[PDB]
């Protein structure tokens, strides 16, 4: 079997994106982030606190004919912004593009953080990570990738994130009209439970590639790009008035610069985060400082490869018994 779904930005700045689920029977479709950096599929529901629902669509498993509580099971996380979300959890079919899977464990959200109320493109996540992740007690739970690999003509998913417009998560094949070139494939750890990688390098602008070894995550579901304060700083420098401000909470650089483009490498590949892909525009409504889309990591205790550098790419999840990541240009 295969999927193939259309994920779109949620706003002007690329902030997140959200793919259509179908949850249940009949049908309930919900927007969900897809996150290659958590490992549970939640989702707001007929459960969540009243006041803690502002104009998401909720799932709501007593009109679902195929949804069974998973009794006794909770769940719990809270995301790298200090986000969370917390409740019990039915098991239902899931289809995604296409692609579907009986008995897939839906978190359902009792309780969400102010920051998941207050926005009401996202229904919920949808984690990609790896399973040993899933926040599910007494019986943790698998990832609608890790039960759908099996029944897929290849284990793999692949995201195609667009700039400023929509994208493509496909799974169980590699489309080859949707990249340039050839994908290099790198090793991955496990032992954190993420796509974790090591880069070889980064360039700015036209400048020379500095070889050196940078390992992190390709992580969907983080907005910018983390790296060490080393390369963020070498970047930034490179832009006339930006400056790492502790008030706003890093990087800023006048909205009249034209961003410098951002190499990093895989393997022996390339590849380049155009200039524009870096602003992050107004730190608020019609200020002339702008927020940059290439943070410092220190004090995050990892680097993270999110959607400003995956959009650049055609990148392949491989879930073979060794995983590996796949980067192409596009």
Do not use: M
Not at 28 to 39: K, P
Not at 157 to 175: K, M, R, S, V
Not at 312 to 319: E, H, I, K, M
């Amino acid at each position: 079997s295969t999927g193939s779904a259309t994920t779109t930005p949620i706003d002007s700045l690329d902030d997140a994106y959200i793919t259509p689920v179908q949850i249940g029977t009949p049908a309930q479709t919900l927007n969900l982030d897809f996150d290659t950096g958590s490992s549970d599929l939640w989702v707001f529901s007929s459960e969540t606190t009243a006041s803690e629902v502002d104009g998401q669509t909720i799932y709501t498993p007593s009109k679902s004919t195929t949804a069974k509580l998973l009794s006794g099971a909770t769940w719990s996380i809270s995301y790298g912004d200090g986000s969370s979300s917390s409740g019990d959890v039915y098991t239902d079919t899931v289809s995604v593009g296409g692609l579907t899977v009986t008995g897939q464990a839906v978190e359902s959200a009792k309780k969400v953080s102010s920051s998941f109320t207050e926005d009401s493109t996202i229904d919920g996540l949808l984690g990609l990570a790896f399973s040993t992740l899933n926040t599910v007690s007494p019986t943790q739970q698998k990832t609608f990738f890790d039960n759908a690999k099996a029944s897929l003509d290849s284990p793999v998913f692949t995201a195609d994130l667009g700039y400023h417009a929509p994208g493509t998560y496909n799974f169980g094949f590699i489309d080859t009209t949707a990249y340039t070139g050839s994908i290099t494939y790198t090793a991955v750890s496990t032992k954190q439970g993420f796509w974790e990688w090591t880069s070889t390098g980064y360039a700015v602008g036209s400048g020379t590639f500095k070889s050196t070894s940078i390992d992190g995550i390709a992580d969907t579901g983080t907005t910018l790009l983390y790296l060490p304060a080393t390369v963020v700083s070498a970047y930034w420098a490179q832009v006339s008035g930006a400056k790492s401000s502790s008030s706003v909470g890093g990087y800023v650089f006048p909205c009249s610069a034209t961003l410098p483009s951002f190499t990093f490498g895989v393997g022996s590949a390339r590849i380049v985060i155009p200039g524009d892909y870096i602003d992050f525009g107004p730190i608020s409504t019609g200020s002339s400082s702008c927020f940059g889309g290439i943070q410092s990591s220190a004090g995050i205790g990892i680097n993270i490869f999110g959607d400003v550098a995956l959009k650049a790419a055609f990148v392949v999840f491989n879930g073979a018994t060794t995983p590996t990541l796949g980067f192409a240009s596009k």
